[PDB]
Amino acid sequence: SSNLTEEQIAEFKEAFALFDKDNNGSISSSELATVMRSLGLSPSEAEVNDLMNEIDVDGNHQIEFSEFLALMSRQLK
């Protein structure tokens, strides 16, 4: 769309939680990995930690909502 900010953030917040299976405002390797495991992929730490890392602004084996917004921010249009 052409309007994000609080609009994209709010939408992301709901999505972030989806990734975190504990709602602790934080996501670990498996946490973000369970987002595709139930679909039919069962990725290994390599792919699991990869996702959590690609967004881990600090690099602590997990990412927080705000971090999910830094890497998320849509992708193309």
* Closer CB to Ca ion, 10 or 70, in the complex: 70
Smallest gap from Cβ 14 to Ca ion, in A, equals: 15
Contact footprint for Ca ion (CB under 5 A): 20, 22, 24, 26, 56, 58, 60, 63
DSSP characters for 8-40? HHHHHHHHHHHH-SS-SSEEEHHHHHHHHHHHH
Rounded Cα–Cα distance for residues 30 and 51 (Å): 10
Cα dihedral 32/10/71/28 (nearest 10):
-20
Name the helix (H) or strand (E) containing 45: helix 45-55
Smallest gap from Cβ 56 to Ca ion, in A, equals: 5
* Closer CB to Ca ion, 24 or 44, in the complex: 24
**Which residue has the closest beta carbon to Ca ion?**
22
Q: Enumerate the known binding-site residues for Ca(2+).
A: 20, 22, 24, 26, 31, 56, 58, 60, 62, 67
